[PDB]
Design a protein around this nucleic acid. Sequence first.
RNA 1: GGGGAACUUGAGUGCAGAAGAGGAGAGUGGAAUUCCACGUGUAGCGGUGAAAUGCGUAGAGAUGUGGAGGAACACCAGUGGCGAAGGCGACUCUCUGGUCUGUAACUGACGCUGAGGAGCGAAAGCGUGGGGAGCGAACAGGAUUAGAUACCCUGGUAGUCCACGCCGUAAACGAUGAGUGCUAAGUGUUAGGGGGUUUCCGCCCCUUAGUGCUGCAGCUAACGCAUUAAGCACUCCGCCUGGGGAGUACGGUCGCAAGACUGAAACUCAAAGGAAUUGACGGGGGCCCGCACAAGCGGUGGAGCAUGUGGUUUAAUUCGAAG
Lengths: 114, 64, 149
Amino acid sequence: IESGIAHIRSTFNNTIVTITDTHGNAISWSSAGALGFRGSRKSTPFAAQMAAETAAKGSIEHGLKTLEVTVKGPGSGREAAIRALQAAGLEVTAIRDVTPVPHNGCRPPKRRRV
Amino acid sequence: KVCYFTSNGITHIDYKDVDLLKKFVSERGKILPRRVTGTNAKYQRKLTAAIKRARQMALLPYVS
Amino acid sequence: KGPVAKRDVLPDPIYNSKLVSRLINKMMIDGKKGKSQTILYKSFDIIKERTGNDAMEVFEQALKNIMPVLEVKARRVGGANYQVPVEVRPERRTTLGLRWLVNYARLRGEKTMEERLANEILDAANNTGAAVKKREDTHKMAEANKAFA
RNA sequence: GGGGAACUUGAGUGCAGAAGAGGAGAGUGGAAUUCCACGUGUAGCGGUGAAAUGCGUAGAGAUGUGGAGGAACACCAGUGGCGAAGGCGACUCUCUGGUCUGUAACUGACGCUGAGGAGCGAAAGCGUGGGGAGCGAACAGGAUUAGAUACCCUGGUAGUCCACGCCGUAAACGAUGAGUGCUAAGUGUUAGGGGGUUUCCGCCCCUUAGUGCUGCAGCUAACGCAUUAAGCACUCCGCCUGGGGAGUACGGUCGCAAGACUGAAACUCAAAGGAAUUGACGGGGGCCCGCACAAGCGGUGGAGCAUGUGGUUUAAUUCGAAG
C-alpha cells in the first residue's frame, strides 16, 4: 500500500476528497459535509484545505506516500485541495485536469432563472 | 501566417499518411484551428474531414 | 474621508518608563481629570500590597493577557449575514483592550472603585477576568468563522 | 399591334472546371448522462440567498471494471458554405437536385411577372404502431410570501425521438415582393478565371459571381439607406386608407380536432401612432462628497416633572402653525 489516486470533486456546493488504490479500491474519503461545514460553507477554500488535509492524514493508516491527483469539476477546490495535499507532506507526482465534458451529451436542465 | 499546404504546393490529403495529422492535432486530442495553424481556408475542411476519418479508423485518438 | 490619526495626552519625552508615563499621564479614560486619576493611582497601589512586586510590570502583564489578535466584522453579502475576521491594528488593539478593562472594571461590582480596578488588575494578570473571558470568546468565534475571508 | 425575312447581346443547349452542414435512403464511431451487477469504501450525498423536500447503514454519494439502453454530434466553426423559404454540421456508401467560372461549339427572343390553381413549409398539437437516456407543460411535495395555482428546490406525466398520415401556423424579419438597366470610391472575405513575375515558394495588376463593413451623390419626418439602395427609372403581383369594436359576428371553404382562410356592421373615442429633443426616474452603469453610514461617546423613549401639540370637555378652553 504505497501509491494510488486522489479523486477530488470540486462543486459550487461541496468539495469532496477521496483516496484510492491504483486499481480503484478506496481507502479513505472526506468532505466538508464530513467535517461539519454545512450549508454553503462547504464551498470555501478553507474547508477544501481542511477536508483535503484530513483525508491525507487518514491515508497514513495504510501508509501510501507517493500520489497523483485527479481534479474533477470546477470551483475553488480546484487548487485548494492541491496545495493542501502538497503541504500535507505526502508526495504528489502531478495533477490531472480531466473534466467530464462530453461531445454534446443530453441537454442540460432549464436555464436557472425563468 | 504561413500556410503549410500552399508552402510546398501539396495536393489532396491522402489520409493514410498520418504524421502531418499528428502535428495538426492537439496533444489532448482536438484540432488546432486556423488561429494557430494559419492554413488556407479551403484546405481546413478537408483537413478536419481527414482527421475525422482517421479518428473513426482509430489511428488518431478521440481523447488523449 | 481620508485616514487621520493623532497624538493625545502623551507624557514627557525623555526617560519615559511606562510607570512614570502612566504616573504622570496616560490611560485616564474614566471621565474628567480629577476623580479619574486619583482613583487610578489608588487602584495601582492596592496591588503592590497584594503582590509585592512592580505594579506597572503586573499591569502590562495583565494588558498582555488581555491582548487579542483577531476581531470579526459583519458583511451584507448573502442573505445569511456572514461575518469576516480581520487582523487588528496595534492602536486598535491597545485602545480596545483598555476599553474592556475599564468597562468590566466598573461592571464587576465591588463596594468601591479602587478595589474594583485593583481586583480587575489581578484578574487580568491571571487569566480569570471577564475581559479575559470575552477575549477568548471573540478569539474562538473568530477561529470558528475564519473560513470565509 | 398583325404578318414576312434578319441577327445575337436577353434567355438558353454543349464542352471544360470548382465549391458546398442541399436533399432522400442505408450502415458505422466516439465522449458523456442514466440504470443494473460486482470489487474497495464509510456517513453522508445533493441542493439554495438562507434552506428544506428527497436519495443513504437494506452501504448511498465516492471509485474501477463489465454490460444495457436511448439521445445529440465537442473541438472543426468562420457577421463561413449550401438551399427559394422553413432550414441543413460525427463518419461511410447508393440515388438525386441546385449554384458559380471559362467557352463561344449550337437555337435565335424561346423572356418577366403572376389572379385563381398546385406544391413545399420552425416549433407546439392530432391520428395509428413503435421507442422512451436525459430533459421536461400538467401534477406532487419542500421552500418564498400578507397571499404564491409562479419565480426557487426534489421528483415527475404527456411530449421531445422513429415510421406513415393530418394540421398549414410564428417576431415564417433584412419588420425591406420579383425581374431588368444606370450611378464616386475605400476595405475585408468565399469560390473561380487572366496577365507580368517563375509555369514554382508568394508578389503585383485585372477579372465574374456572391458575402460583410465603411462611405459620395441622391433620398428620408428623422433614424438612416447607399452597386447586396430605403437613389435614379420601367414592368408585374400583393397590400393600406384613424384607434377600438375585430381578425370578433354571420355565411361559405378546408380540418379528425384544435382551429385556419375569406371577412362586415352597430356603437364609441379625438385621438392612437413613428422618429427624435430636454428633463425626470431606474430593485441600469462609471466617479465624488456630506457624524450619510461605519469607529466610538453621551442620550431619548422605562420613572417623575416642565412645556408644546393632538383628542375630549367646557360658556369659552382666542386665533395661526401640520413630514
